[PDB]
Design an enzyme around this catalytic site. Structure first.
Site, PDB file in Angstrom:
ATOM      1  N   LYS A 195       0.828  -1.234   0.180  1.00 60.75           N
ATOM      2  CA  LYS A 195       0.006   0.001  -0.044  1.00 60.75           C
ATOM      3  C   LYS A 195       0.809   1.230  -0.093  1.00 60.75           C
ATOM      4  O   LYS A 195       0.432   2.118  -0.676  1.00 60.75           O
ATOM      5  CB  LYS A 195      -0.943   0.160   1.182  1.00 60.75           C
ATOM      6  CG  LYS A 195      -1.688   1.383   1.431  1.00 60.75           C
ATOM      7  CD  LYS A 195      -2.811   1.177   2.317  1.00 60.75           C
ATOM      8  CE  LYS A 195      -3.171   2.462   2.882  1.00 60.75           C
ATOM      9  NZ  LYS A 195      -2.285   3.028   4.045  1.00 60.75           N
ATOM     10  N   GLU A 255      -2.511   7.198  12.908  1.00 60.24           N
ATOM     11  CA  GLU A 255      -1.880   6.275  12.263  1.00 60.24           C
ATOM     12  C   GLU A 255      -0.770   5.867  13.370  1.00 60.24           C
ATOM     13  O   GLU A 255      -0.227   6.629  13.994  1.00 60.24           O
ATOM     14  CB  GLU A 255      -0.833   7.249  11.170  1.00 60.24           C
ATOM     15  CG  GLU A 255      -0.196   6.214  10.443  1.00 60.24           C
ATOM     16  CD  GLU A 255      -0.932   5.480   9.323  1.00 60.24           C
ATOM     17  OE1 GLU A 255      -1.559   4.402   9.702  1.00 60.24           O
ATOM     18  OE2 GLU A 255      -0.828   5.708   8.015  1.00 60.24           O
ATOM     19  N   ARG A 256      -0.522   4.434  13.494  1.00 66.05           N
ATOM     20  CA  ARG A 256       0.669   4.024  14.422  1.00 66.05           C
ATOM     21  C   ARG A 256       1.927   4.693  13.909  1.00 66.05           C
ATOM     22  O   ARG A 256       2.497   4.505  12.843  1.00 66.05           O
ATOM     23  CB  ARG A 256       0.422   2.277  14.080  1.00 66.05           C
ATOM     24  CG  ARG A 256       0.501   1.967  12.664  1.00 66.05           C
ATOM     25  CD  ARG A 256       0.254   0.276  12.689  1.00 66.05           C
ATOM     26  NE  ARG A 256      -1.102  -0.072  12.982  1.00 66.05           N
ATOM     27  CZ  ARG A 256      -1.683  -1.026  12.778  1.00 66.05           C
ATOM     28  NH1 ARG A 256      -0.922  -2.034  12.203  1.00 66.05           N
ATOM     29  NH2 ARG A 256      -2.918  -1.629  13.396  1.00 66.05           N
TER      30      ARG A 256
END
Ligand SMILES: Nc1ncnc2c1ncn2[C@@H]1O[C@H](COP(=O)(O)OP(=O)(O)OP(=O)(O)O)[C@@H](O)[C@H]1O
Lengths: 481, 51, 502, 245, 72, 247, 72
Positions: free
Chosen positions: A163, A189-190
């Site tokens: 991705k 978002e990690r």
């Protein structure tokens, strides 16, 4: 706006109910910073927005940073307007949190111009009529499952499937072919994946570490560290930072809002915190309204398109539950990145069969494009069927009217793989941008029956079809040696 | 060979029908899961206030 | 309540200046607790239950639930700029809407306010939101056909003027271009359409309204459109103003056709509007009131008797089974409130039948009483052939058979099913779909190349009316499929088969 | 419900008549109770209904009782919501009714109208004293055949019809004949589609079911029994089906 | 019938009578249990007793639990 | 439950003797907490229990520990609410309970008593250096054979017993033999069985399972392993059944 | 065991400690990390940690979300 000093009466976890004098009151979504005092001895100010009014001059506000260390009675200051996001050409390259302060520590961003987050919808007269195809530059997307400019796009595939290289290709190809810039809008978002993406950008020429304000991304990272009011509003922050680009430079903008289910999750978090009675399976009651307010400002205004690309992560893998239901009610093109295809190495890993788009219809794409796309999907259906049988019968035993189908199916499955302007850092291939007309004529030549003699590995990792014939002719030159 | 092809077509229509049954069972399982979870949540919230 | 909404210090100051003193406040009230789209106003003792109270900014509100002190209203526009302490004033009208014959063509924003931006509309208000639904003596049974245009719909699942008929599909499969087709086919006959989009992405309603623009339906249609970026109260009241606006033309002796879009989305916005109130929900967290909601809405669309003038309104709501289950709360609820279902299966539209109508499930309770006197017999024969094909394809006759179809009936059923598919937004007239039905059912063409029956019948339709205008006259004047018309269309299709052979 | 019920009970108690009250959509009464008691401040109950969902509808049902003067045969078209019978609003009506017939949507999705599901449909009048051992025994035999079919439907799942032995194959053929025969063109469903209605009597349908269960009608195909009246008319429909081929 | 009491409560009884019907039966049978006659109480729709107790406890506004049934 | 714990804690703190407390239906110690917590003013938790389910359950279970003065061995007859093995009341007690033993209605409806599940019932005393190497190996082989049977339950039920392999058929018959051999005539369950009870030691059941799953005696009928004390009694019941078959 | 801080929370330890234990081990390992040493913090039963947070919040009367787990 005003020194609207109030006292932070109630602080339940992240939610902090602030009172106000009876004269002036900040309305809903009107950001307010509290002049807080940290445990360390520095006057750090955690910003908030009024999610709800509770009547007796006490506006229930959710915090964009940790409330650990907010005495009641702290001076809360109203801004008179929603969270001012430092939009402009300046915010092209740096990383941002929700309140709009660069966390990549490079430097300050020009706040000479700023737009509020919660600007309302565009209008009916301002929306554009023509359902215009959005030329991405990936042969798979442009042929099989086109993207709608001004529309919505779902990248169903998870991470590890490719991705990140796909979105990097999309941003670089937007900056190269089209005239616009993109805005990655990572919501929840990690942080490890955030720094992964940022370093991939900085090493892939997508954003220049030596040259900011020449780069092609406006990173908005709402890390999951931040309270639920923050990573919920990070989507809208990215949205207004891209809407300034749209309605000020009249250019095509891309929003790479990370998986929407985190935005809906954060909405559920903040609504359960506000105590508003939960809806179906457990997302907020204002789920349709909130996610529509996030994904309705994604519209191709007469100024320019603001087409977004939104990952969607179905929980427990069902299209039925409300959050994926209310999301897929909005998406206009759904392209899944397939893990097995990624492991094969048919980059980009976007699955040609299971991916679909509402734009694919002939009145939208073109009659020849619809015909060739439906024929390619039927051919790949035939190959997914005969993958069972070519193990038992072999390629020779089965009938030679569909041996042609299997051959052209291998040719299509390889020709869909395109080298990227981003994969140059990994492998060394230059990278080819393939227009819609070029891939249309290439697939027409592949599927019509002319190129039934070129080898199967001549279509793998090539751009235009004439370049595939060039690859095959070079293989023919080297065949003698 | 005729018996083996009859067993093949039996297993083939059985695989297709099992695919259809798996799809229908997944749909029923998702609606059951959502109904169970929303009933649980309404139980919890309605018992929370108890005026 | 220990924390009552009438306990703000300023508010109780107003009452504590005089306990049993000078006459109270008549019509002036300060808004307080203007939160979840529900402003609690103090005062306003003259407010009729259901008043149309205005605010300082100019955002209209319905005063639904008014308690002992606070007249809690449901403000229509988003209650963002409304600050606590602002003064409001009731207007003295009971949920009234401005409506006139000048709305035909406009794009209303669910408050009788134009959103197209080209001028403002004048009217005599004269219509209510919570109107008395038509009584029992006033409704006369549905007989007048309504030319939906689609072969499948108007052949097996007919719709008549005044017979509500939902369109229960799945997500991203028909119902929008399908409802647009039904509106678009209404060009010649006089109807005043109301395409009220409850929840639609603004780009979709822009595409639909521009389709209407270029194809000429704007001369009669009225897009009461509400985007998905709208407060849930406006998405809740959008079909109510749509229905009142269509009733202004239904009560004046003029046939109308209202089409709600995403009637599941109105129930979802009512779910929001209630769970913000914390009113106790029921199944799937709907507040249980959704049946009464879709009763007031869908039940005010029926044909009136000659006493109140021959008026009519089919309702054609569009529920979306996002769950993929027809036995979900709001789809089964709207099916119970409506007079019949037109199921748009997702699997058939993914297969290729572009009007995704499946014939077994989709029924029309009004039945053959709705159809024209011409089409009843021929559509009965077609429905017979469709039953035959449905069984032959759903059940045995996979091995050749004792029956041995594809020689007698499976080929003809496949011709019928491949004939039912339409182009995108290409409406078919009454006589044309009559001949299209007749060709396949009574075996005029069976052995053709099954892939291109449509590709033949486009040439057939192009040739027949220009060759034999007698057919259009016999179907347009008599409205009955006489056998002399059968003879002349036999001659016309003979000549068409000739010119297709060459 | 209360006002129509008072209108009927005045006739049953003062004029001594055998009046009927076809109360339609009992569930709509209970759901109206749900609305009013969600707004009346009464505390919520099971899934959404009023707390008094078993005393208010008790005041409905228990007033419908055949007194020693006159008798009333109410036919209450109670509506299961979302098509599950475990719901409390019809579950509290199951205990009050005595000849409950569950119109399951399955047989209507198959096209068998009426869709009265023969397994779920049950009555306290299916007793030996009431109907005679003849009709009772045939009812037991047909419910036996249909129950065996429904329990081996789990095998007419993933596998095929062929995998059954001769026993299960015969009982499936008989069960299909029966569940097709249980359809009937109504005298009021002339409007939707089909034949004019046929009035089928008890001592007449008992002959048809005795004939089907006696095995003497294996020759007829399935679409011959569908949407037909008496068994002689079923054989006539089969003969005409063979003539029309 | 000479030995069988039938403590019967209709549907249209107020929900306290439905809740107290099995208790009346248990007390009237326990009188015979203390009179050393081996009695036999048979409840009918013991779901209806807990349902009427739920109706009372929800009409008393005592907090409910699973299936909206009250605590005890 | 706290009263039982106080008596046991006295007998473990002062009398210096290892005590064996049996608590029956420890789930009542949580459900009564639910019925009081509802009224008490504490908010409801998941499916309907008290909020402090876990801390109360721990306040009972932690006080049961061998504490250098003795050893309180304890066998709580936890009640799984309608076999909701994921419910909070057993989900919190699985963390505290060392040698858990999940009894299943599934293996009781076919009459195999005790209804202990061979798979689900697991203990942290099945480590080899603690329990004995051969015993550990026999336990592993029995659990694996039962797991293979539970995985072939779908193929057997649908596609017929014959449609699987002829070694896997031996594993199926061996799993049947095992899951019937681990039935026991209790002394207190003689009123339910009608047959007298046989108390059988550990080494005897190991020696039985060795010969059962070693393939040495796969000829006996399945009913000869049902409700039997020892493998020698199973051999005798095979003779009894073979005589009763012809007689 | 030379290099392993086993932060132990017994069952009868109150709700706040079973809530705070991951943060305590995190504050130890964060020190050991910020002083250049790679670490490895292995939590145990985050479902039990969230259960302890559920306890303390529902006692503190904070509105519950899905599965009755609290807001945050
Ligand atoms: N008969 C048809 N033939 C070909 N394409 C069609 C047809 N009807 C609709 N479409 C395609 O469907 C798209 C519109 O979506 P559709 O009407 O199928 O569902 P929808 O109602 O818009 O979905 P939602 O309910 O989520 O709004 C259009 O882009 C059009 O190209």
């Amino acid at each position: 706006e005003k020194k609207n000093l109030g006292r932070i009466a109630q602080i339940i976890g992240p939610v902090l109910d602030v009172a106000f004098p009876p004269g002036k009151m900040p309305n809903i979504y009107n950001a307010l910073i509290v002049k807080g005092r940290d445990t360390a001895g520095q006057p750090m100010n955690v910003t908030c927005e009024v999610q709800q009014l509770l009547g007796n001059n006490r506006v229930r506000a959710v915090a964009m940073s940790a409330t650990d260390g907010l005495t009641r009675g702290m001076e809360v200051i109203d801004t008179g307007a929603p969270l001012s996001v430092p939009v402009g050409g300046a915010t092209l390259g740096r990383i941002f949190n929700v309140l709009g302060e660069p966390v990549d520590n490079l430097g300050p961003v020009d706040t000479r111009t700023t737009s509020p987050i919660h600007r309302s919808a565009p209008a009916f007269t301002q929306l554009d009529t023509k359902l215009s195809i959005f030329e991405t530059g990936i042969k798979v997307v442009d042929l099989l499952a086109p993207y709608r400019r001004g529309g919505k796009i779902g990248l169903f595939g998870g991470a590890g499937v490719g991705k990140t290289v796909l979105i990097m290709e999309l941003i670089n190809n937007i900056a190269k072919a089209h005239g616009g810039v993109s805005v990655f809008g990572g919501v929840g978002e990690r942080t490890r994946e955030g720094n992964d993406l940022y370093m991939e950008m900085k090493e892939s020429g997508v954003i220049n570490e030596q040259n900011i304000a020449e780069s092609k991304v406006a990173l908005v990272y709402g890390q999951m560290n931040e309270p639920p009011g923050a990573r919920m509003r990070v989507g809208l922050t990215a949205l207004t930072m891209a809407e300034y680009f749209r309605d000020v430079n009249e250019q095509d903008v891309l929003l790479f809002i990370d998986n929407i289910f985190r935005f809906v999750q954060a909405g559920s978090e903040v609504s359960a915190l506000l105590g508003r009675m939960p809806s179906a399976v457990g997302y907020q009651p204002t789920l349709s309204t909130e996610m529509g307010s996030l994904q309705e400002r994604i519209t191709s205004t007469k100024e320019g398109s603001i087409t977004s690309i939104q990952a969607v992560y179905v929980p427990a893998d069902d299209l039925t539950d409300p959050a994926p239901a209310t999301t897929f009610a909005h998406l206009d093109a759904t392209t899944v990145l397939s893990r097995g295809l990624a492991a094969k190495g048919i980059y980009p890993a976007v699955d040609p069969l299971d991916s679909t788009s509402t734009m694919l219809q002939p009145r939208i794409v073109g009659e020849e494009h619809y015909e060739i796309a439906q024929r390619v999907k039927e051919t790949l259906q035939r190959y997914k069927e005969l993958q069972d049988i070519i193990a038992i019968l072999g390629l020779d035993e089965l009938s030679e009217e569909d041996r042609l189908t299997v051959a052209r199916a291998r040719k299509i499955e390889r020709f869909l793989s395109q080298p990227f302007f981003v994969a140059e850092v990994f492998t060394g291939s230059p990278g080819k941008y393939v227009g819609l007309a070029e891939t249309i004529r290439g697939f027409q030549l592949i599927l019509s029956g002319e190129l039934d003699s070129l080898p199967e590995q001549a279509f793998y990792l090539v751009g235009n079809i004439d370049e595939a014939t060039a690859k095959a002719m070079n293989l023919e030159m080297e065949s003698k040696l | 060979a005729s018996e083996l092809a009859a067993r093949m077509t039996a297993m083939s229509n059985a695989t297709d029908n099992a695919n259809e049954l798996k799809k229908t069972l997944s749909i029923n399982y998702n609606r059951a899961r959502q109904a169970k979870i929303t009933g649980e949540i309404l139980e919890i919230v309605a018992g929370a206030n108890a005026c | 309540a220990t924390i009552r909404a009438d306990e703000i210090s300023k508010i109780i100051r107003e009452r504590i200046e005089g306990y049993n003193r000078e006459v109270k406040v008549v019509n002036t009230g300060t808004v307080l607790q203007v939160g979840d789209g529900i402003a609690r106003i103090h005062g306003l003792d003259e407010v009729m239950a259901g008043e149309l109270v205005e605010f300082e900014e100019g955002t209209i509100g319905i005063a639904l639930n008014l308690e002992s002190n606070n007249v809690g209203v449901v403000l229509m526009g988003d209650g963002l700029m409304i600050q606590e302490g602002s003064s409001v004033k009731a207007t003295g009208r009971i949920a009234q809407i401005p409506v006139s014959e000048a709305y035909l063509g406009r794009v209303i924003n669910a408050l009788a306010k134009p959103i197209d931006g080209r001028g403002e509309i004048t009217a005599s208000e004269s219509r209510l939101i919570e109107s008395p639904a038509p009584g029992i003596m006033s409704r006369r049974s549905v007989y007048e056909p309504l030319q939906t245009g689609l072969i499948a719909i108007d052949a097996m699942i007919p719709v008549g003027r005044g017979q509500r008929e939902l369109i229960i599909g799945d997500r991203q499969t028909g119902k929008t271009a399908v409802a647009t087709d039904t509106i678009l086919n209404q060009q010649g006959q006089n109807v005043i359409c109301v395409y009220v989009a409850i929840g639609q992405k603004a780009s979709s309603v822009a595409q639909v309204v521009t389709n209407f623009q270029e194809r000429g339906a704007m001369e009669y249609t009225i897009v009461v459109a509400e985007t998905a970026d709208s407060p849930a109260t406006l998405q809740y009241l959008a079909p109510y103003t749509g229905a009142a606006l269509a009733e202004y033309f239904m009560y004046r002796e003029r046939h109308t056709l209202i089409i709600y879009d995403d009637l599941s989305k109105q129930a979802q916005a009512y779910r929001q509007m209630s769970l913000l109130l914390r009113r106790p929900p029921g199944r799937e967290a709907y507040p249980g009131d959704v049946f009464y909601l879709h009763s007031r809405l869908l039940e005010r669309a029926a044909k009136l008797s000659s006493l109140l003038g021959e008026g009519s309104m089919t309702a054609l709501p569009i529920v979306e089974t996002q769950a993929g289950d027809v036995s979900a709360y709001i789809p089964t609820n709207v099916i119970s409130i409506t007079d019949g279902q037109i199921f748009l299966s997702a699997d058939l539209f993914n297969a290729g039948i572009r009007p995704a109508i499946n014939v077994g499930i989709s029924v029309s309770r009004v039945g053959s009483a709705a159809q024209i006197k011409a089409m009843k017999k021929v559509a009965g024969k077609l429905k017979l052939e469709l039953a035959q094909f449905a069984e032959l394809e759903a059940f045995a006759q996979f091995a050749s058979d004792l029956d041995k179809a594809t020689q007698n009936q499976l080929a003809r059923g496949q011709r019928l099913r491949e004939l039912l598919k339409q182009p995108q937004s290409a409406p078919l007239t009454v006589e044309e779909q009559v001949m299209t039905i007749y060709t396949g059912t009574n075996g005029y063409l069976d052995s053709l190349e099954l892939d291109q029956v449509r590709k033949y019948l486009v040439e057939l339709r192009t040739y027949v009316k220009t060759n034999k205008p007698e057919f259009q006259e016999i179907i347009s004047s008599t409205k009955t499929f006489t056998e002399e018309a059968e003879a002349l269309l036999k001659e016309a299709i003979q000549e068409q088969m000739e010119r297709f052979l060459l």
